[PDB]
């Protein structure tokens, strides 16, 4: 990736910024800009490229073959009991929360068993993340 | 990716910004801009490209073959009981929440068993994310 | 992706912005802009490209073959009982919520068993996301 | 990656910034900029490239073969019981939270059993992250 | 990576910054900038490259072969019981939280059993991270 930029507030090439009650007198600004950008990116010169997969099985006996790919959960138990009992009481609850499984961003590109890959693969994530604001 | 930009507030090439009760006097601004951009991106020069997959089975005996791809959940139990009992009580509840499974963004590109791939693959995610604001 | 931009508020090439009771005096602005953009993107030069898949089975015995693709859920139980019992009580509930499975954005491109792919694949997601605002 | 930049507040080439009630007198600014950028990135010169995978099985006996890919969870138990009992009491709860499994950003590129890969792979993550703000 | 930059507040080539009620008198600024950048990055010159994997099994007997990839969890138990009992009491709780498993950023590139890889692989993470702010 030639350019990746996380810019919180202000991004600019040339900035004249005047703010919060200033006095801006005789000003002469002369700006002469020559800017040129040449991008030669991902250029590929190939005579011959071959992807070849071959399998042959002869006179064989195969019994109980199990192939299990990734990300298997099987047996998961979440037990979260909440019990509130009051006889003669005063209860004030402000900003209370229970969260079990919270997922913001899931990016999954190549999940397989057998992968043959020729090329280019890129993942980019940018965020501002605030979970809980109370008060 | 040639250019990826996360810009919170303001993005500009040339900015004259005057704000919050300033006094802006005699100003002479002369701006002369020569800007040229040439993008040669993803150019491919190929005589011959071959993707070849072949399978042959002869005189074989195959019994109990099981192939299971990725992301298998099987047995998942969520138990979240909530019981509230009050005899003679005062209960004030403000901004209370229960969330079990919350998913914002799920991106899944290549999930398979066998994959043969020639080319280019790109995933880009940008967000501002605030979960809970109370008060 | 040549250009991806997350811009919260203001995006502009040249900006003269005057705001919140300023006094803007004699101003001379002369702007001379030469801007040229040339995009050569995804150009492909191919004599011959071949995608060839062949399978042959001879004199074979196949019994109990099971192929199961991805994303299998099987057995999932969500139990969320809520019981409220009051004899002589005062109950004030403001902004209370229960959510089990909430999904904003699901993007699924290539989910298969066998995939042969020549080309280009791109996924882009941009959002502003606020879940719960109370008060 | 030629350029990666985390910029909290302000990013600019040339900045004239005047802020918080200054007095800006006779100013002469003459700016002459010649800037040129040439990017030759990811250029590949290949006569012949071959990816070849071949398997042959003959006169063999295979019984109880199990292949299990990565990220297997099996048996996971989360027990979080909460019990509150009050006879004659005053309870004030402000900003209380229980979270079991919270995931912001999950990026998974190549998870397989057998992978043959020719090319370029890049993962970039930038964020501002604040979990809980109370008061 | 040619350039990686963590910049907390301000990044600029040439900066004239005037702030907090200064008096800026007769100023003459003459700026003459010649800046040129040439990037030749990731250029590869290859006659022939061969990735070849071959397996042959003959007249063999294979029983109880188990191959288990990485990141296996098996049996994990989280027990966090919380019990609060008050007869005649005053309880004030401000900013109290219980978190079991919290994950901000998980990046997984190449997790496999057998991997043959020709190329370039890069992971870059930049963040500002504050967990809990109370008061
Ligand atoms: C601008 O310069 C002239 C020079 O003749 C001067 O008389 C005038 O007072 C100046 N005004 C300001 C606002 O700087
Ligand atoms: C502006 O820049 C160009 C770039 O070569 C130059 O030829 C020209 O003389 C400059 N003009 C002035 C007034 O400096
Ligand atoms: C590579 O590209 C150049 C053009 O930039 C061309 O002249 C040359 O013949 C190419 N070589 C091959 C056939 O791979
Ligand atoms: C195949 O597996 C099953 C259960 O996994 C088992 O009961 C059976 O005996 C196995 N077959 C042989 C020939 O061992
Ligand atoms: C602008 O400049 C002229 C120069 O003759 C001066 O008389 C005038 O007061 C100036 N006005 C402002 C608003 O700067
Ligand atoms: C404006 O820029 C062009 C770019 O070459 C230049 O030829 C021209 O002389 C400039 N004009 C002035 C008034 O500086
Ligand atoms: C590659 O492209 C160039 C044009 O840029 C062409 O002259 C050359 O013959 C090509 N080579 C081949 C046939 O791969
Ligand atoms: C095939 O599998 C089933 C259950 O998985 C088992 O009952 C059976 O005996 C197996 N067959 C052989 C020949 O082992
Ligand atoms: C503009 O400039 C002229 C110069 O003759 C001056 O007389 C006038 O007061 C100025 N007015 C403003 C609003 O700057
Ligand atoms: C405006 O820019 C063009 C671009 O070449 C230039 O030829 C011309 O002289 C410029 N005009 C002025 C008044 O500077
Ligand atoms: C590639 O494209 C060029 C034109 O840009 C052409 O002259 C050349 O013959 C092409 N090569 C082939 C046939 O792949
Ligand atoms: C095929 O599978 C079934 C159940 O999966 C099993 O009952 C049966 O015995 C199997 N056949 C053989 C020949 O093992
Ligand atoms: C600008 O310079 C002139 C020079 O003749 C001077 O008379 C004037 O007072 C100056 N004004 C400011 C605002 O600096
Ligand atoms: C501006 O920069 C260019 C770059 O070569 C130069 O030729 C020209 O003389 C400069 N102009 C001035 C007024 O210095
Ligand atoms: C490599 O590229 C150059 C052009 O930059 C070309 O002249 C040369 O023939 C190429 N070599 C090969 C065929 O790999
Ligand atoms: C194959 O495995 C099963 C259970 O994993 C077992 O009961 C059986 O006896 C095994 N077969 C042989 C021939 O050992
Ligand atoms: C600027 O310089 C001139 C020189 O003649 C002087 O008279 C004037 O007072 C100066 N003004 C400022 C604001 O420095
Ligand atoms: C500005 O820089 C260029 C760069 O070579 C030079 O040729 C020119 O003479 C400079 N101009 C001045 C006024 O110094
Ligand atoms: C390597 O690249 C050069 C061009 O920079 C080219 O002249 C030379 O023939 C190439 N060598 C090979 C064929 O690997
Ligand atoms: C294969 O493994 C199973 C359990 O893992 C076992 O009961 C069985 O006896 C084994 N087979 C042989 C031939 O040892």
Tab-separated table of N, CA, C and O in Angstrom, chain A residues 7 9-17 33, chain B residues 5 7-17 31 33, chain C residues 5-7 9-17, chain D residues 11-15:
chain	number	residue	atom	x	y	z
A	7	UNK	N	-5.802	10.293	9.978
A	7	UNK	CA	-5.691	11.712	10.300
A	7	UNK	C	-6.868	12.128	11.168
A	7	UNK	O	-8.000	12.232	10.682
A	9	UNK	N	-7.874	15.017	12.730
A	9	UNK	CA	-8.640	16.252	12.609
A	9	UNK	C	-8.520	16.882	11.226
A	9	UNK	O	-9.520	17.010	10.510
A	10	UNK	N	-7.312	17.301	10.843
A	10	UNK	CA	-7.144	18.133	9.656
A	10	UNK	C	-5.980	17.652	8.805
A	10	UNK	O	-4.850	17.553	9.291
A	11	UNK	N	-6.251	17.415	7.521
A	11	UNK	CA	-5.228	17.048	6.548
A	11	UNK	C	-5.321	17.987	5.357
A	11	UNK	O	-6.380	18.089	4.730
A	12	UNK	N	-4.210	18.638	5.021
A	12	UNK	CA	-4.220	19.577	3.910
A	12	UNK	C	-2.815	19.748	3.351
A	12	UNK	O	-1.824	19.628	4.074
A	13	UNK	N	-2.750	20.094	2.065
A	13	UNK	CA	-1.458	20.345	1.433
A	13	UNK	C	-0.864	21.664	1.912
A	13	UNK	O	0.217	21.694	2.511
A	14	UNK	N	-1.560	22.769	1.657
A	14	UNK	CA	-1.157	24.089	2.131
A	14	UNK	C	-2.323	24.693	2.898
A	14	UNK	O	-3.433	24.795	2.363
A	15	UNK	N	-2.070	25.121	4.133
A	15	UNK	CA	-3.123	25.592	5.024
A	15	UNK	C	-2.819	26.998	5.514
A	15	UNK	O	-1.782	27.228	6.143
A	16	UNK	N	-3.736	27.920	5.251
A	16	UNK	CA	-3.804	29.204	5.939
A	16	UNK	C	-5.038	29.143	6.829
A	16	UNK	O	-6.167	29.201	6.331
A	17	UNK	N	-4.834	28.990	8.134
A	17	UNK	CA	-5.937	28.825	9.072
A	17	UNK	C	-5.892	29.941	10.103
A	17	UNK	O	-4.897	30.090	10.820
A	33	UNK	N	3.035	26.232	-7.223
A	33	UNK	CA	3.186	24.815	-6.903
A	33	UNK	C	3.218	23.994	-8.184
A	33	UNK	O	2.224	23.944	-8.919
B	5	UNK	N	-7.398	6.898	3.216
B	5	UNK	CA	-7.295	8.061	4.135
B	5	UNK	C	-8.453	8.106	5.129
B	5	UNK	O	-9.613	8.135	4.680
B	7	UNK	N	-10.083	10.537	7.556
B	7	UNK	CA	-9.978	11.955	7.886
B	7	UNK	C	-11.156	12.361	8.757
B	7	UNK	O	-12.289	12.463	8.271
B	8	UNK	N	-10.869	12.674	10.023
B	8	UNK	CA	-11.931	12.900	10.988
B	8	UNK	C	-12.797	14.103	10.669
B	8	UNK	O	-14.025	14.027	10.720
B	9	UNK	N	-12.175	15.235	10.335
B	9	UNK	CA	-12.946	16.469	10.222
B	9	UNK	C	-12.828	17.107	8.842
B	9	UNK	O	-13.829	17.235	8.127
B	10	UNK	N	-11.623	17.533	8.462
B	10	UNK	CA	-11.456	18.374	7.281
B	10	UNK	C	-10.290	17.902	6.427
B	10	UNK	O	-9.160	17.805	6.914
B	11	UNK	N	-10.560	17.672	5.143
B	11	UNK	CA	-9.536	17.315	4.167
B	11	UNK	C	-9.631	18.261	2.982
B	11	UNK	O	-10.691	18.364	2.356
B	12	UNK	N	-8.522	18.918	2.650
B	12	UNK	CA	-8.537	19.864	1.545
B	12	UNK	C	-7.133	20.046	0.988
B	12	UNK	O	-6.141	19.924	1.710
B	13	UNK	N	-7.068	20.399	-0.296
B	13	UNK	CA	-5.777	20.659	-0.926
B	13	UNK	C	-5.189	21.978	-0.439
B	13	UNK	O	-4.108	22.009	0.161
B	14	UNK	N	-5.889	23.082	-0.686
B	14	UNK	CA	-5.492	24.400	-0.205
B	14	UNK	C	-6.660	24.995	0.565
B	14	UNK	O	-7.771	25.095	0.031
B	15	UNK	N	-6.410	25.416	1.803
B	15	UNK	CA	-7.465	25.877	2.696
B	15	UNK	C	-7.166	27.281	3.195
B	15	UNK	O	-6.131	27.512	3.826
B	16	UNK	N	-8.088	28.202	2.938
B	16	UNK	CA	-8.160	29.481	3.633
B	16	UNK	C	-9.395	29.410	4.522
B	16	UNK	O	-10.525	29.466	4.024
B	17	UNK	N	-9.191	29.249	5.826
B	17	UNK	CA	-10.294	29.074	6.763
B	17	UNK	C	-10.254	30.183	7.801
B	17	UNK	O	-9.260	30.333	8.519
B	31	UNK	N	-2.652	32.146	-6.291
B	31	UNK	CA	-2.391	30.714	-6.211
B	31	UNK	C	-2.317	30.120	-7.610
B	31	UNK	O	-3.314	30.111	-8.339
B	33	UNK	N	-1.304	26.617	-9.544
B	33	UNK	CA	-1.148	25.199	-9.234
B	33	UNK	C	-1.112	24.386	-10.519
B	33	UNK	O	-2.106	24.336	-11.254
C	5	UNK	N	-11.677	7.180	0.768
C	5	UNK	CA	-11.578	8.339	1.693
C	5	UNK	C	-12.736	8.373	2.687
C	5	UNK	O	-13.896	8.399	2.239
C	6	UNK	N	-12.426	8.391	3.987
C	6	UNK	CA	-13.447	8.517	5.016
C	6	UNK	C	-13.380	9.972	5.453
C	6	UNK	O	-12.423	10.353	6.132
C	7	UNK	N	-14.377	10.782	5.129
C	7	UNK	CA	-14.278	12.200	5.468
C	7	UNK	C	-15.458	12.595	6.341
C	7	UNK	O	-16.591	12.695	5.856
C	9	UNK	N	-16.488	15.455	7.936
C	9	UNK	CA	-17.265	16.686	7.830
C	9	UNK	C	-17.150	17.333	6.455
C	9	UNK	O	-18.150	17.462	5.741
C	10	UNK	N	-15.946	17.767	6.076
C	10	UNK	CA	-15.783	18.615	4.901
C	10	UNK	C	-14.615	18.154	4.044
C	10	UNK	O	-13.485	18.058	4.530
C	11	UNK	N	-14.884	17.930	2.759
C	11	UNK	CA	-13.858	17.583	1.780
C	11	UNK	C	-13.958	18.536	0.601
C	11	UNK	O	-15.018	18.638	-0.025
C	12	UNK	N	-12.852	19.199	0.273
C	12	UNK	CA	-12.870	20.152	-0.826
C	12	UNK	C	-11.467	20.343	-1.383
C	12	UNK	O	-10.475	20.220	-0.661
C	13	UNK	N	-11.403	20.705	-2.664
C	13	UNK	CA	-10.114	20.973	-3.292
C	13	UNK	C	-9.531	22.291	-2.798
C	13	UNK	O	-8.450	22.323	-2.198
C	14	UNK	N	-10.236	23.394	-3.039
C	14	UNK	CA	-9.845	24.711	-2.549
C	14	UNK	C	-11.015	25.296	-1.776
C	14	UNK	O	-12.126	25.395	-2.309
C	15	UNK	N	-10.766	25.711	-0.536
C	15	UNK	CA	-11.823	26.162	0.360
C	15	UNK	C	-11.531	27.564	0.868
C	15	UNK	O	-10.497	27.796	1.500
C	16	UNK	N	-12.457	28.483	0.616
C	16	UNK	CA	-12.534	29.757	1.318
C	16	UNK	C	-13.769	29.676	2.206
C	16	UNK	O	-14.898	29.730	1.710
C	17	UNK	N	-13.563	29.509	3.511
C	17	UNK	CA	-14.666	29.322	4.446
C	17	UNK	C	-14.630	30.426	5.491
C	17	UNK	O	-13.637	30.576	6.210
D	11	UNK	N	-1.935	17.151	9.904
D	11	UNK	CA	-0.914	16.775	8.933
D	11	UNK	C	-1.003	17.707	7.736
D	11	UNK	O	-2.062	17.810	7.109
D	12	UNK	N	0.112	18.351	7.396
D	12	UNK	CA	0.105	19.284	6.279
D	12	UNK	C	1.510	19.446	5.719
D	12	UNK	O	2.501	19.325	6.443
D	13	UNK	N	1.576	19.784	4.431
D	13	UNK	CA	2.869	20.025	3.798
D	13	UNK	C	3.469	21.344	4.268
D	13	UNK	O	4.550	21.374	4.867
D	14	UNK	N	2.777	22.452	4.008
D	14	UNK	CA	3.186	23.772	4.473
D	14	UNK	C	2.023	24.386	5.236
D	14	UNK	O	0.913	24.489	4.701
D	15	UNK	N	2.277	24.820	6.469
D	15	UNK	CA	1.227	25.301	7.356
D	15	UNK	C	1.537	26.708	7.838
D	15	UNK	O	2.575	26.938	8.465
